[PDB]
Amino acid sequence: AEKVLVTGGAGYIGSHTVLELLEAGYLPVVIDNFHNAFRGGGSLPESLRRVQELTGRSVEFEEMDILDQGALQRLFKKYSFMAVIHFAGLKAVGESVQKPLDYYRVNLTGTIQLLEIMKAHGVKNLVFSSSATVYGNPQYLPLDEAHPTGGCTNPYGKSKFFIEEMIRDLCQADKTWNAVLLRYFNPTGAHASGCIGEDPQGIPNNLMPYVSQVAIGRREALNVFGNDYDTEDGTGVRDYIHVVDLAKGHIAALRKLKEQCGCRIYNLGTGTGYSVLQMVQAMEKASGKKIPYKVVARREGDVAACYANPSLAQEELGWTAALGLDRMCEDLWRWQKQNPSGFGT
Amino acid sequence: MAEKVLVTGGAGYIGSHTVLELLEAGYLPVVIDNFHNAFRGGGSLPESLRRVQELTGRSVEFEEMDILDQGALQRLFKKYSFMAVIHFAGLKAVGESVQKPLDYYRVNLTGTIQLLEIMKAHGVKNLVFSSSATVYGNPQYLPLDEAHPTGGCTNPYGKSKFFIEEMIRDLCQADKTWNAVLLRYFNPTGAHASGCIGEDPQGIPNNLMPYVSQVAIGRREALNVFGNDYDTEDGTGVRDYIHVVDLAKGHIAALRKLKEQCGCRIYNLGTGTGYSVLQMVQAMEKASGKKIPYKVVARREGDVAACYANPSLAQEELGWTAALGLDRMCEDLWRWQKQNPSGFGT
Numbered sequence: 019a020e021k022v023l024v025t026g027g028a029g030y031i032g033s034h035t036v037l038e039l040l041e042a043g044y045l046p047v048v049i050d051n052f053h054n055a056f057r058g059g060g061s062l063p064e065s066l067r068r069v070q071e072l073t074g075r076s077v078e079f080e081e082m083d084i085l086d087q088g089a090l091q092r093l094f095k096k097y098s099f100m101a102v103i104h105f106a107g108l109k110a111v112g113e114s115v116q117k118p119l120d121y122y123r124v125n126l127t128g129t130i131q132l133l134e135i136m137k138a139h140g141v142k143n144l145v146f147s148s149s150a151t152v153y154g155n156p157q158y159l160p161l162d163e164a165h166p167t168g169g170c171t172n173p174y175g176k177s178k179f180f181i182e183e184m185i186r187d188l189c190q191a192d193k194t195w196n197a198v199l200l201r202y203f204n205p206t207g208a209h210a211s212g213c214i215g216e217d218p219q220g221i222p223n224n225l226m227p228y229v230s231q232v233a234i235g236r237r238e239a240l241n242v243f244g245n246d247y248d249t250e251d252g253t254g255v256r257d258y259i260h261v262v263d264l265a266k267g268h269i270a271a272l273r274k275l276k277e278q279c280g281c282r283i284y285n286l287g288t289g290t291g292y293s294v295l296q297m298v299q300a301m302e303k304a305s306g307k308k309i310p311y312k313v314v315a316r317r318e319g320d321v322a323a324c325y326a327n328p329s330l331a332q333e334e335l336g337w338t339a340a341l342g343l344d345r346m347c348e349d350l351w352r353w354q355k356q357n358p359s360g361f362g363t
Numbered sequence: 364m365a366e367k368v369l370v371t372g373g374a375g376y377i378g379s380h381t382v383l384e385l386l387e388a389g390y391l392p393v394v395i396d397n398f399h400n401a402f403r404g405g406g407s408l409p410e411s412l413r414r415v416q417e418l419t420g421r422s423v424e425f426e427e428m429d430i431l432d433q434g435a436l437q438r439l440f441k442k443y444s445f446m447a448v449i450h451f452a453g454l455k456a457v458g459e460s461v462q463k464p465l466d467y468y469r470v471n472l473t474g475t476i477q478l479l480e481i482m483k484a485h486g487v488k489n490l491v492f493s494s495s496a497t498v499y500g501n502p503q504y505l506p507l508d509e510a511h512p513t514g515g516c517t518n519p520y521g522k523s524k525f526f527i528e529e530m531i532r533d534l535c536q537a538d539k540t541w542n543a544v545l546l547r548y549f550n551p552t553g554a555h556a557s558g559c560i561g562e563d564p565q566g567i568p569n570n571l572m573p574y575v576s577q578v579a580i581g582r583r584e585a586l587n588v589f590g591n592d593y594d595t596e597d598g599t600g601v602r603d604y605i606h607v608v609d610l611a612k613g614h615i616a617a618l619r620k621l622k623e624q625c626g627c628r629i630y631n632l633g634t635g636t637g638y639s640v641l642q643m644v645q646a647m648e649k650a651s652g653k654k655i656p657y658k659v660v661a662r663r664e665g666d667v668a669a670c671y672a673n674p675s676l677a678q679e680e681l682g683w684t685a686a687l688g689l690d691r692m693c694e695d696l697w698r699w700q701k702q703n704p705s706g707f708g709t
């Protein structure tokens with residue numbers, strides 16, 4: 019009746035969201051298998067221990083895989099969840115092209131297993147981590163919720179779109195379900211404290227963490243994936259949104275579920291697009307470092323540009339992304355500088 | 364021929380017929396099935412397979428198991444050397460799908476993903492998949508060629524088939540070492556000529572033909588025709604009925620194609636000719652010599668007016684075509700029904 023299950027909560031967006039939830043008086047229970055998150059010293063992952071410290075509130079956590087029915091059943095028997103925020107999954111567009119089965123497995127099969135447990139336990143309130151990739155190659159920009167979905171350019175985007183469809187079907191089959199599908203754009207930045215941030219395990223697939231690792235000196239130079247796109251400078255254009263703003267959108271989503279909203283879909287973006295080179299520039303500026311780069315071939319699955327029309331979320335969720343580029347860059351750099359090796363090494 | 368061909372859902376309708384064709388064509392099948400929609404034999408083998416053994420004088424290796432059981436699947440791939448996999452296993456009750464979506468996603472999606480993962484792990488990268496004309500969504504033009512748009516399915520069952528195609532297409536695009544033939548079946552009907560095996564619907568049939576045959580035999584009072592106000596010659600739905608034996612043979616063609624290291628290939632398995640509900644009723648009265656009373660009721664949710672294949676690509680590239688006609692299909696269906704009033708058993 020009270021707890022909020024947060025899958026993949028030790029990750030980038032999840033950790034920030036657990037923070038916001040706690041600050042807002044909610045009671046999160048987090049699960050993660052650490053596939054893409056650093057393991058803390060103690061029971062808690064590093065990221066979560068830090069959130070526990072920043073908020074002053076306990077973080078209930080369990081190490082587990084969403085693909086383990088057993089563990090999930092156990093978890094649901096142990097806690098009385100009121101809702102589920104589902105972040106757990108694989109998220110690299112380019113990797114998906116090469117390892118489709120891993121994506122279908124973790125993203126599709128893992129979500130199906132979670133929905134089955136939820137249904138079984140009567141916890142029919144969900145917030146799902148969707149993505150702008152479900153729009154496939156943009157037919158128009160900015161992207162609104164009315165733009166066609168499907169015809170994705172990569173297996174990851176298909177996996178997200180397929181999940182949206184399953185959810186719509188589930189909601190059609192049972193009107194008692196409420197589900198908010200959040201199509202995020204490109205989150206960046208970090209908690210203002212600089213204590214938590216984006217700390218991928220291994221080499222970063224995302225632009226910004228890679229860029230920050232270059233500025234801090236952990237990486238020699240950034241590889242720019244193509245410069246022959248139909249954009250102002252030829253490099254990819256994305257709608258960067260502060261991870262803090264994005265995290266806050268989850269609280270608004272929780273409120274929407276309480277209205278017995280049914281199945282709803284909202285973009286979570288700023289509406290302002292920035293190119294690869296513009297991001298590098300903003301980061302040189304924030305870090306005071308030179309961010310060497312070189313142009314390589316395009317990365318399969320990538321689109322030239324994508325940015326959101328965030329009006330719907332403002333109208334129905336009463337949410338808007340407050341923070342801008344400067345703030346994103348500044349927050350990112352603060353985290354990087356305070357944590358040159360991320361959470362640990 | 365020492366390597367084996369794994370046939371999932373092989374105790375079922377299309378699968379059993381396919382197993383028979385594989386044996387006759389010299390392949391060595393290993394069949395798996397969980398009995399979800401197949402009748403348990405008196406012994407270990409499913410009845411359908413027991414009969415296929417007698418009809419061919421050849422043996423069928425069989426293991427009772429669920430594709431969702433990773434442990435059993437992993438053991439299976441250790442036990443045998445497979446050169447290819449023909450994947451028939453799955454749930455197919457469209458109506459139930461609209462009500463139990465997750466069951467459909469679990470069995471069809473998760474089941475396939477597991478199978479593909481185990482195949483990969485053991486170096487088996489040759490697949491034949493049971494797809495369906497439903498992936499084309501509501502027809503935008505007729506006849507339906509492989510290039511007609513896919514997706515936009517109207518029920519979970521259909522969406523699941525489309526999702527599986529996409530996954531396989533993605534796997535093939537990623538890895539040029541994979542070969543996969545996606546077969547879009549249209550409306551399988553008929554039965555093996557011996558009348559020994561056929562479609563054995565569990566409970567009230569959801570498809571037209573078994574409902575028709577069951578009426579003929581008196582197992583059902585009368586046929587309910589789902590609408591007669593469609594934009595068709597007689598107003599009833601039009602479909603491309605294709606003999607299960609021809610369909611089965613298409614799978615042998617598929618194996619041959621895989622041998623060509625064909626990558627991802629997609630072919631319709633239809634005849635190219637559509638027939639209306641009323642036309643099938645008349646053809647069944649002709650074949651059976653029995654009365655088949657009907658009554659026109661409301662349209663059934665999700666039905667399209669007409670659906671039929673463009674069989675050219677299959678003929679030219681898969682090197683296959685349906686040889687059996689309408690009368691043969693009805694005749695064969697009737698023989699099976701007549702000789703087995705209650706389907707399988709003893």
Ligand SMILES: NC(=O)C1=CN([C@@H]2O[C@H](COP(=O)(O)OP(=O)(O)OC[C@H]3O[C@@H](n4cnc5c(N)ncnc54)[C@H](O)[C@@H]3O)[C@@H](O)[C@H]2O)C=CC1
Pocket residue numbers: 025026027028029030031032049050051052053054055082083084085104105106107108109124128147148149150201202203204205
């Ligand atoms: N970062 C981005 O730009 C975007 C992210 N998304 C989605 O948001 C979600 C969270 O993304 P991020 O926080 O950026 O990535 P992340 O990799 O930091 O977070 C995902 C978390 O899931 C965990 N995880 C992975 N597989 C798991 C499994 N089988 N069981 C349990 N935990 C598992 C990982 O260890 C990780 O902590 C994902 O679903 C992602 O696809 C969608 C759009 C934007």
Ligand SMILES: NC(=O)C1=CN([C@@H]2O[C@H](COP(=O)(O)OP(=O)(O)OC[C@H]3O[C@@H](n4cnc5c(N)ncnc54)[C@H](O)[C@@H]3O)[C@@H](O)[C@H]2O)C=CC1
Pocket residue numbers: 371372373374375376377378395396397398399400401428429430431450451452453454455470474493494495496548549550551
């Ligand atoms: N009959 C038709 O009109 C069409 C059939 N298809 C597809 O062709 C395939 C075969 O169709 P049919 O022979 O008519 O159906 P069927 O139900 O007779 O055959 C499927 C077989 O799969 C087995 N099975 C189900 N779930 C299983 C699981 N989890 N593990 C192991 N075995 C399992 C069932 O027990 C059954 O013997 C299916 O994938 C179906 O969706 C596609 C188009 C048309």
Ligand SMILES: O=c1ccn([C@@H]2O[C@H](COP(=O)(O)OP(=O)(O)O[C@H]3O[C@H](CO)[C@@H](O)[C@H](O)[C@H]3O)[C@@H](O)[C@H]2O)c(=O)[nH]1
Pocket residue numbers: 109110111149150151202203204205223224225226228240241242243244253254255256294317320324
């Ligand atoms: O080393 C790198 C990494 C990225 N890029 C480019 O930078 C941009 C952003 O790339 P990336 O951070 O990988 O983000 P996306 O591929 O746009 O996808 C992100 O944003 C999507 C929503 O827009 C989510 O679906 C994905 O999970 C999330 O990874 C693109 O134009 C990339 O080509 C480079 O040039 N070099």
Ligand SMILES: O=c1ccn([C@@H]2O[C@H](COP(=O)(O)OP(=O)(O)O[C@H]3O[C@H](CO)[C@@H](O)[C@H](O)[C@H]3O)[C@@H](O)[C@H]2O)c(=O)[nH]1
Pocket residue numbers: 455495496497548549550551569570571572574587588589590599600601602640663666670
């Ligand atoms: O009791 C019945 C059953 C069917 N019909 C009609 O007969 C036609 C055929 O219906 P049915 O046998 O259920 O076949 P389809 O709905 O066309 O679907 C079959 O063929 C599809 C591909 O064409 C596959 O996706 C399915 O799995 C398979 O069941 C349609 O016009 C129906 O409206 C009736 O009038 N009465």
Ligand SMILES: C[N+](C)(C)C
Pocket residue numbers: 156157158159
């Ligand atoms: C029209 N667009 C392809 C430039 C978005």
Ligand SMILES: C[N+](C)(C)C
Pocket residue numbers: 364388389390
């Ligand atoms: C006869 N065979 C080798 C083609 C199976």
Ligand SMILES: C[N+](C)(C)C
Pocket residue numbers: 619620623680681682
């Ligand atoms: C194997 N094939 C040449 C008949 C396509």
Ligand SMILES: [Mg+2]
Pocket residue numbers: 536537
């Ligand atoms: Mg390639």
Ligand SMILES: [Mg+2]
Pocket residue numbers: 654
């Ligand atoms: Mg009469």
